[PDB]
Amino acid sequence: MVYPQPKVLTPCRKDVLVVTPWLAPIVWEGTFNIDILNEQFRLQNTTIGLTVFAIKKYVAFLKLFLETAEKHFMVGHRVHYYVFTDQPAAVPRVTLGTGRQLSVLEVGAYKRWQDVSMRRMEMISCERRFLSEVDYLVCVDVDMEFRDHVGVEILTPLFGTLHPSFYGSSREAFTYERRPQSQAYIPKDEGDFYYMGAFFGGSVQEVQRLTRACHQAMMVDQANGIEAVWHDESHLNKYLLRHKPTKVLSPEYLWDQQLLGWPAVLRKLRFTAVPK
Amino acid sequence: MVYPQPKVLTPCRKDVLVVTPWLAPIVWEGTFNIDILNEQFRLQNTTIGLTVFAIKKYVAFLKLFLETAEKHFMVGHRVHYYVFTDQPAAVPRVTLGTGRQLSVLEVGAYKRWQDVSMRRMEMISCERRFLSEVDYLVCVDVDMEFRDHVGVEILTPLFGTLHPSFYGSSREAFTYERRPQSQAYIPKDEGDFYYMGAFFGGSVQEVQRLTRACHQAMMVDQANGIEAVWHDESHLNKYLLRHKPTKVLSPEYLWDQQLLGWPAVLRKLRFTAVPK
Ligand SMILES: O=c1ccn([C@@H]2O[C@H](COP(=O)(O)OP(=O)(O)O)[C@@H](O)[C@H]2O)c(=O)[nH]1
Ligand SMILES: O=c1ccn([C@@H]2O[C@H](COP(=O)(O)OP(=O)(O)O)[C@@H](O)[C@H]2O)c(=O)[nH]1
Ligand SMILES: OC[C@H]1O[C@@H](O)[C@H](O)[C@@H](O)[C@H]1O
Ligand SMILES: OC[C@H]1O[C@@H](O)[C@H](O)[C@@H](O)[C@H]1O
Ligand SMILES: [Mn+2]
Ligand SMILES: [Mn+2]
């Protein structure tokens, strides 16, 4: 297998940070040779599970989400979609590529948007089925579309994704939970990045750990009369501060061209918000 | 725990490649916050085994090697030195820091320098003792001294170290084995880096795999009447081409100031050749 030689005195990207201070790759276009990664992951017959909640009106987002995932998400690898919905008959029948399957998991609807978004951690953690069926789990919002490659480069024991509104910001600007009353509490002088709750994942074991931890933390907050400021994302950020991810995705992986344009530092816009 | 904020639009190092195309960190000063890594590794009570062969005249190199390892190598972590020698009474008694131990393993001497260097793979692979006693194994030459920090930043499932004579070179210049007759054979259009046999390591499982593979490959070459051009290092390079390391050490970790000076791109010279 023949490819460009990496040269150690020629960096790929000089414009962005491509490794965290705990030596986790930060995933940008030009940092990876996908042909190498694809080979490595195919040699293990990797199966990737993709979880998405479509509760209430959000079933409307599934057709574009799944169609575009078929075009861009882990193409060539085994993929198992898990669609959590209160409306199984509303899941569109989208034609899938070979090695790809979809399961519909019927769940209850909470009235409040905070609990729908928040009880995802609980819903994800359903535990023995993921362990037997997939190697990795990827957990994303449904109001999104894939516009470019999202592949095995993201796979690692634990990853989070840089929030597109805060990647160029200083930590005191991060909208972490700042009340010491909350399990999600992070002091003003702490913090690596501000991760978005819309795209995280890892090995099935590490995702079950994270989601269990976040759920346990939110129940503690509830039994104490406090709701973290950005809810699941607050707790996600506290978890990833204390258990550092082994890869970080750049904002190529979570973007909104309408709000933020297409800056030169983003060579690809891979997974983006749908207008709502 | 309070530290400088990484900023994603300010890279650490813009002068060197800090991640390989398969997303393994390349370990340079300024890429890592050691306080973070130290915490992570201490939380697992990590034990690092360091193997060194001192056969014949090479026992003379042990005092400086061990004294300087006490100053710089994994300080604060548990360390088990394994000294393979034909002369147990010649191992100097060096005073060790707390949590550090040394074992002397008596082995036979081969007459030829090629077989002394080459049979290390066999000698390392002695298998159940490493699995029970250490988490990682680091395998180095003895004619060396530590001059600066060599710590848990290097630890990963599998690592190799960039040969200091070839890091700025193109692959056709690499002195890989070029005869298809040899198990170590690498074609002219293949190859990522040229790794030095003087410094490799990983988890005990991955080092046992590598050393078993290299030994099996060299026995095949022997039963076929060919000796790879740079011996163990040829086979090391073939193994690491096909099983890509999960970290690569920069030449800060294997250098010779007498032959190569102190170039600006090396902010630290950590482990260096002793005149011989
Ligand atoms: O009525 C709702 C509200 C939220 N969600 C799920 O929870 C996710 C996060 O909520 P949302 O996308 O509304 O949050 P935002 O991106 O606006 O902050 C959604 O993508 C859906 O997967 C849902 O299914 N139905
Ligand atoms: O007579 C010898 C020759 C080699 N070695 C071991 O094999 C390693 C590699 O050999 P050497 O350092 O001579 O190779 P070089 O760096 O010169 O290529 C040495 O560091 C020792 O650990 C040894 O113990 N005794
Ligand atoms: O937490 C800061 C917030 O950033 C907003 O831009 C986003 O819409 C919210 O979902 C939340 O992530
Ligand atoms: O393989 C090329 C060679 O490079 C030399 O500089 C070194 O002394 C040898 O041990 C070998 O590594
Ligand atoms: Mn959303
Ligand atoms: Mn040597």
Automatic annotation (TrEMBL), chains A, B:
An alpha-L-fucosyl-(1->2)-beta-D-galactosyl derivative binds at H163, T175, E233, D256. GO terms for molecular function: hexosyltransferase activity; metal ion binding. It is a single-pass type II membrane protein. The keyword Transmembrane applies. Keywords: Glycosyltransferase, Manganese, Membrane, Metal-binding, Signal-anchor, Transferase, Transmembrane, Transmembrane helix. Its main location: membrane. Mn(2+) binds at D141, D143. GO terms for biological process: carbohydrate metabolic process. UDP-N-acetyl-alpha-D-galactosamine binds at F53, A54, I55, Y58, D141, V142, D143. It is found in: Membrane. The active site is at E233. One of its GO terms (cellular component) is membrane. Binds 1 Mn(2+) ion per subunit. Its cofactor is Mn(2+). It comes from the Eukaryota. Belongs to the glycosyltransferase 6 family. This is Histo-blood group ABO system transferase. It comes from Homo sapiens (Human). The lineage of its organism: Eukaryota, Metazoa, Chordata, Craniata, Vertebrata. The gene is ABO. The chain holds residues 69 to 346 of 354 of the full protein.
